[PDB]
Copies of this chain bind each other. A is one copy, B any other.
C-alpha cells in the first residue's frame, strides 16, 4: 500500500490513508472508537515513559481509581451503566469522563494536616466522553487513553508553580519528543475548566485545515473543589484551611497531532526520539551473490548500532524486493534506512537515506554509529524547525474585526488585542459562524465554522497604550490567539 491522496489536496483522505496503511489504527463497529495497533502504541509507550519519569522526579506517584462513579457523587456526554445482565441497578453508575469526583472524596479523607501536603497523584487510564460530533482518529474520540494528575497544596502559590511546571512538561512532550511546536497560554473565562480558577494550555495548529487544537491542559483549581468536597488541612496553629488544587491531563491526541504535523505525501514521518524503529537495515539480496556474507554484516552493524542505543530492525525478507521495502518503511515513517549490498561491503560503507528529505549519505562502517546519532538529531531538529516556521506563518496579527474573515479564509489563526469580556467571545463565535456559512454557500459546499479563543499567550507582544479591542472597541487588555478549532 502506498499513500495516494495528497496532503495538500484532500487532507482528510490523506490522514486516513496514512494512519491505516501504516497499520497504526483499525476501525471498530462502535462510532468514535478505534483500535490502536502496535505501530501507534509503541509511540504512546515512549511518551508515557518520558512523562512518567519526569513527574516522578517531581514526587508525583501513580495510582488507580475505579472507572465507575455513583450518580450522586458525579452529580455534585456521560455514558451510563444501568443494568448488570438484565437486572436494573438501583442507582445507575457512570463511566468516568474525568476523575475529580472519584478521587476528591478520598483526598478529603487522606488530608488532615499540613504535614500531609502536598499530595500529588497521577493515573494512566482511559476515559469516555460520549459526544455525537464528527470523531477523528487520535484527535477527537469517544474513548481515549490519557493521564490525569491531581495535586493538593497548602498554598495557592505552590499549586500555581506546579501548574506551570506541568505545562512545561507538556511543552516538552510535544516539542522535545514529538517535534511539534506549541503555544503556552491561558484559556479565556468562557473556555476554562468550569469548576477551576484558571486553565492553562498548550495549543497546536494544523495548517492544512487552518484549525487550532488544544494539545494538553493544566488547571489551577484553587479552593473551589476543596469547598465542594471539604478537603481541609490544619496548620501548626490548628486552624482548618482549604487546600489549593491542580489537575492536568494529556491524551493520545498528541499522536494525531504529530502525524499531521510531520507526514508527507509518502505517508508518516516519525521523529527519531519516539520512533520504535529508528534505522531499518535493508540488505540487497541478489540471487548471484554471497547472501550469507551480506546478512552477517547486517547483523554486525545492528549490534554495533544497538551499542549506541539506536533502535534497529533488519528487514531480510526474501520474498519482497528492495523497492517494496523502501516504500513499506517510508509509509510507516521510519526516519532512517540503511542499504547494504555487495558493492557497499566491498567498499566498507553503507548507504543511508533520511526519511524527511530523501537525502542519501555514504558512511564508512566505523563512523556509522556517531554519524547516525548526529543525523537523527538533525532530523529531529529539522522536523521541529520546519513545523515551527509553518506555525509562525499560520498566525496573522490583526487589529480590527474586518481582518478576521480573510485571515480565516487563508486557514490562519489571528492574534488580536482583546478586551476579554466573556459576552464578546460568544458574539464573535456566533458572528464568524454565520459569516462562514455565507461563505460556504458562495463556494458551493461538517466541522464548525466558528472562530473562538484558543489561548491568551504567555508570550505577549507589546501593547501600545490606548489599543482598542478588535471587536468591542472597548480598551483592549491582552493579545489573544483565535481561530477555528477542533
User: A interface vs B, CB < 8 Å?
Assistant: 26, 28-30, 33-38, 41-42, 44-45, 61-68, 70, 73, 77-86, 92-93, 95, 105-106, 109-110, 115, 121, 125-126, 128, 130, 143, 145, 319
Contact = CB atoms under 8 A, between A and B. Distances in A.
Nearest to A145: B64
Number of copies: 2
A44 B123 CA distance: 13
A332 to B, nearest CB: 14
B41 A64 contact: yes
Nearest to A125: B126
23 contacts: A26-B106, A29-B70, A29-B105, A30-B66, A33-B66, A33-B68, A35-B65, A38-B61, A38-B62, A38-B63, A44-B64, A45-B62, A64-B145, A66-B143, A67-B128, A68-B143, A79-B84, A80-B83, A81-B81, A82-B82, A85-B130, A115-B319, A125-B126
A106 B26 CA distance: 8
A473 B472 CA distance: 95
B30 A68 contact: yes
B36 A70 contact: no
Contacts of A92: 83
Contacts of A125: 126
Given A68-B143, A83-B80, A106 B35 contact: yes
Contacts of A62: 38, 41-42, 45
A463 to B, nearest CB: 43
Contacts of A30: 66, 68, 70, 93
Contact of A82 (B28, B36, B83, B95): B83
Nearest to A60: B38
B26 A41 contact: no
Contacts of A38: 61-63, 121
A95 B81 contact: yes
A196 B82 CA distance: 31
A116 to B, nearest CB: 11
A77 B85 contact: yes
Nearest to A120: B38
Contacts of A70: 29-30
